[PDB]
Write a protein that binds this ligand. Structure first.
Ligand SMILES: CC(C)CCC[C@@H](C)CCC[C@@H](C)CCC[C@@H](C)CCOC[C@@H](CO[C@@H]1O[C@H](CO)[C@@H](O)[C@H](O)[C@H]1O[C@H]1O[C@H](CO[C@@H]2O[C@H](CO)[C@H](O)[C@H](O)[C@H]2O)[C@@H](O)[C@H](O)[C@@H]1O)OCC[C@H](C)CCC[C@H](C)CCC[C@H](C)CCCC(C)C
Ligand SMILES: CC(C)CCC[C@@H](C)CCC[C@@H](C)CCC[C@@H](C)CCOC[C@@H](CO[C@@H]1O[C@H](CO)[C@@H](O)[C@H](O)[C@H]1O[C@H]1O[C@H](CO[C@@H]2O[C@H](CO)[C@H](O)[C@H](O)[C@H]2O)[C@@H](O)[C@H](O)[C@@H]1O)OCC[C@H](C)CCC[C@H](C)CCC[C@H](C)CCCC(C)C
Ligand SMILES: CC(C)CCC[C@@H](C)CCC[C@@H](C)CCC[C@@H](C)CCOC[C@@H](CO[C@@H]1O[C@H](CO)[C@@H](O)[C@H](O)[C@H]1O[C@H]1O[C@H](CO[C@@H]2O[C@H](CO)[C@H](O)[C@H](O)[C@H]2O)[C@@H](O)[C@H](O)[C@@H]1O)OCC[C@H](C)CCC[C@H](C)CCC[C@H](C)CCCC(C)C
Ligand code: L3P
Ligand code: L3P
Ligand code: L3P
Ligand code: L3P
Ligand code: L3P
Ligand code: RET
Ligand code: RET
Ligand code: RET
Lengths: 227, 227, 227
């Protein structure tokens, strides 16, 4: 159920909150329209994460789902978060590399399917089916990481060194971090309950904060965001 | 509960409906692609408002939420409306002033959070928490009004007199009207039930019709929408 | 109820699935950014259709709605599908014809209302009201078909013969196919239950597969998608 993980939810709420304030209080005197975009995108990521983490701490983002033969605690707020949040992160990567509109649309589409499909899995009552959705969701993710690693890097090679190197760091951080989510999900309370909801919430928190605040920090503190 | 406010819901449905028909039957012979955008955006605002007002009149947009120690009548359709509707209005303002993509994204993002956060508050069962969400939602709104008043006006000063003056009127109308919503919400059935759902529905109706049909009228009947 | 139509749901799932794989394994070596857009848009249509068809086969996309004086089986997954799917198809048509942003926004808006309004109708408990929503939804559709037939054709006349002719075929296929949906809905389980859910699911399947895979095939196998 949901009570002992309250501390990781409170800390996540706090970290996303402070992360938003910091990015806000840093893009204030920015005149460059390109940099402006990066700050707007990057600042909204933790801001959204803040509201959803708060809904989980306060209990609104938690529901109960029966499967296997029990009532399981499912924090559905994560999907609401990730639905807008993961595409924004992808958008940062795309602008940095100047991706084609077509690929940006393919990426956002793949991402929406990944999260939507992951949400359906989390709320499915037939235990066995949850894993089918997990598989579809993971296939979507793999497609996204493939394009960022192989497709985007190539695109980054045509920009100036500052941009190419910052993209490289951001690229490595998201590929590694993003692939941990399906694993956490599979072994957590949403799948084979090997790991307790307590530790699971701590894992997602570290992952979320790293994939947003950290990512944001690496990006917003480089000159890559400038023309 | 919901029954005696049926008249304000029926009138709102009617006014949004006639408002859509009028804007539609006015943008028919418009060749200017810029003006076309304004008509498309502005016409969809009342059209959406029409469908949601109708759902409330017919009872579908009403739900019951327990909090304090009672079953409260919450018209959730408003948020569904405002979720697409408020950003469209912001988009009209942005095109008129030729805002940067970055700021447009920040505004739409702030707006989505404002409505989403306001929806969560309206459906929260812990009476005390509803106000936390209200606070977050209001902070988001204040951020939006700040940019429209101080940021956009500056941008409008670089356009021709017709555009600058129409923007000024639209700006004053939305800043004043938008700030009334959180007050109505706070004192209405969603917050401290000082005002009866009856009078509350009448307030939102006047506010909604003014902020859409009125706004649309001020905009679509000026030459500001032309290049 | 839902059980005997499982075969049409399984076949639809299969066809959308194979349809996605085929389009994916065809746009692989495409360098043209314009063609790229078409492949991205067109491939995502069946991909989304796949996930929603699967949710219906597995039972998640089915709910029960009381109206008339009974518990009716309503596959709500269709709307989730169509909400993103119909606009994407419209986007293909718009790019092919190089439509104005204003009209694209009017079309997407009309489309969202059509599906949203159709969803509300499908879930409404007052039998009589369901048809009011159906009427509003159909009016929205008629507005869309009008613009595609009369507005877009004109726009297509200014492109080269390959584009104009492919647009013509796509135009005829969507106008005819799209208008069948409201009829199926009206006579199916969502409206006057003249046709059994069994036959209804078979009708939507043929319509869906034709309006996506077929449409995609006609488009992706022509040179129209190139500059
Ligand atoms: C403009 C865009 C293009 C915007 C579009 C936004 C929208 C489409 C996003 C949807 C996102 C999806 C992914 C999340 C939905 C998940 C869905 C499956 C879960 C839905 O459930 C929650 C929903 C409704 O809450 C409820 O109200 C109903 C009506 O009154 C009730 O009938 C429900 O029961 C009620 O559910 C709540 O309460 C349940 C309680 O049960 C009880 O448990 C307690 C425990 O102590 C006790 O046991 C009781 O006895 C028992 O009864 C609980 O179980 C439920 O979980 C739930 O709390 O909520 C709506 C949420 C809203 C949509 C969140 C918004 C998210 C944020 C703010 C979005 C910011 C987005 C902007 C748009 C991004 C901008 C950037 C872009 C430009 C890129
Ligand atoms: C393409 C885009 C990018 C589009 C995305 C669109 C989508 C994400 C928008 C979401 C918007 C959000 C903000 C609204 C959701 C609020 C949410 C919390 C509330 C959800 O509840 C309603 C929902 C489901 O209805 C229900 O069906 C279920 C399944 O069958 C049932 O299990 C539920 O119970 C049922 O709920 C209804 O009935 C309840 C009844 O209870 C009873 O009360 C009676 C009273 O007499 C009596 O007491 C009975 O005994 C008792 O049981 C009732 O309480 C509930 O409130 C409810 O009526 O509804 C889905 C709504 C749908 C999403 C509305 C669409 C809005 C319009 C048409 C959108 C137009 C948008 C276009 C996209 C804009 C284009 C412009 C852009 C380009 C900028
Ligand atoms: C980024 C974007 C801009 C993205 C936005 C996405 C979002 C807003 C889309 C919303 C789309 C709308 C149109 C669909 C919503 C319809 C809505 C009215 C119906 C909602 O109900 C389902 C919902 C929740 O499921 C449930 O969880 C709750 C919490 O735990 C429970 O309280 C509910 O009860 C539960 O409902 C399920 O179970 C019910 C079971 O009852 C039982 O029946 C069995 C039968 O054997 C038995 O009798 C039992 O005893 C009895 O109790 C069942 O009746 C219900 O129907 C339901 O199964 O589900 C959330 C779905 C999720 C949103 C689907 C996502 C769709 C796909 C993957 C989208 C891909 C999109 C990308 C974004 C497109 C990209 C392209 C663009 C760029 C153009
Ligand atoms: C604990 C918290 C996490 C909880 C908070 C609740 C929160 C969920 C609600 C708040 C909404 C929030 C999510 C909104 C996100 C905004 C974010 C995306 C913004 C990123 O930033 C994008 C920029 C766009 O810039 P511009 O306006 O276009 O400026 C043009 C300039 O004039 C040069 O033009 P030139 O090129 O021609 O030379 O935002 C506009 C730049 C402006 C010019 C400057 C604006 C300054 C701000 C108003 C002040 C900064 C905030 C404060 C330090 C405190 C924040 C409090 C909070 C409650 C709002
Ligand atoms: C009671 C009611 C509230 C209930 C109604 C239900 C409602 C919810 C469903 C309807 C959907 C509705 C919401 C859709 C909104 C549409 C709105 C946003 C449109 C705004 O308008 C945008 C324009 C885009 O213009 P274009 O097509 O691109 O024209 C280009 C021209 O050829 C010049 O080109 P050049 O530059 O090269 O010289 O719409 C296209 C312009 C067209 C060329 C002209 C179209 C005319 C219309 C078809 C007729 C107008 C409507 C009728 C008077 C009656 C309406 C009935 C209703 C049921 C539809
Ligand atoms: C929601 C709140 C919790 C969060 C509020 C955010 C606030 C603390 C920070 C605002 C920062 C922003 C001004 C950034 C500085 C930019 C820098 C160039 C300085 C210029 O800022 C100075 C002026 C513009 O100057 P002008 O040229 O004369 O035009 O801003 C005009 C500034 C105005 C004086 C402030 C805007 C007015 C708001 C309407 C007031 C909001 C506070 C409410 C009183 C709180 C009610 C809560 C209640 C429940 C207790
Ligand atoms: C049974 C199934 C239905 C179930 C599947 C589950 C599914 C729901 C989840 C998968 C997500 C899926 C929906 C995603 C849709 C993607 C689709 C929209 C893509 C359409 O395609 C758009 C392109 C964008 O192209 P680019 O990257 O920008 O290439 C630029 C080039 O370098 C030239 O540049 P120049 O102009 O300068 O010269 O996608 C990128 C092009 C790449 C360069 C090439 C990519 C190749 C692919 C990685 C391999 C193709 C797929 C495989 C055959 C098998 C698919 C398995 C599935 C599980 C993913
Ligand atoms: C949903 C309805 C409630 C609302 C319907 C809207 C309608 C009343 C208004 C349409 C206005 C639109 C034509 C605006 C005028 C533009 C002006 C330049 C005149 C040209 O309009 C003339 C022609 C195009 O001429 P073409 O050059 O030969 O090509 O439009 C071709 C016009 C066609 C004759 C009309 C489109 C055909 C539709 C398929 C018919 C829709 C009505 C159904 C019979 C209603 C069934 C409801 C049932 C439940 C009772
Ligand atoms: C700020 C949040 C971030 C960066 C979240 C990333 C999330 C993912 C990559 C989630 C992926 C999932 C799967 C591949 C399968 C199972 C379910 C999910 C949704 C956890
Ligand atoms: C057509 C509708 C319009 C212009 C609606 C505007 C709505 C707002 C500015 C709503 C703001 C709210 C808050 C700031 C806090 C509490 C809840 C809301 C959603 C009523
Ligand atoms: C891939 C799916 C396609 C092309 C779906 C098209 C759907 C429509 C044109 C649906 C229209 C409807 C109405 C006009 C009224 C009643 C309800 C609907 C949603 C079935």
């Amino acid at each position: 159920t949901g009570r002992p993980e309250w501390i990781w939810l409170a800390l996540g709420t706090a970290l996303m909150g402070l992360g938003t304030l910091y990015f806000l209080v840093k893009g204030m005197g920015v005149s460059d329209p390109d940099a402006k975009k990066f700050y707007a995108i990057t600042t909204l990521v933790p801001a959204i994460a803040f509201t959803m983490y708060l809904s989980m701490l306060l209990g609104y983002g938690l529901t109960m789902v029966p499967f296997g033969g029990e009532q399981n605690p499912i924090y559905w707020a994560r999907y609401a978060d990730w639905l807008f949040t993961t595409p924004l992160l992808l958008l940062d990567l795309a602008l940095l590399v100047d991706a084609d509109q077509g690929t940006i649309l393919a990426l956002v589409g793949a991402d929406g399917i990944m999260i939507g499909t992951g949400l359906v899995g989390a709320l499915t009552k037939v235990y066995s089916y949850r894993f089918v959705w997990w598989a579809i969701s993971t296939a979507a993710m793999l497609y996204i990481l493939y394009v960022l690693f192989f497709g985007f890097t190539s695109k980054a090679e045509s920009m100036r060194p500052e941009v190419a190197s910052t993209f490289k760091v951001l690229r490595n951080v998201t590929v590694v971090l993003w692939s941990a989510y399906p694993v956490v999900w599979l072994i957590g309370s949403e799948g084979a309950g090997i790991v307790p909801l307590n530790i699971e919430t701590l894992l997602f928190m570290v992952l979320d904060v790293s994939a947003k605040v950290g990512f944001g920090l690496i990006l917003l503190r480089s000159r890559a965001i400038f023309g």
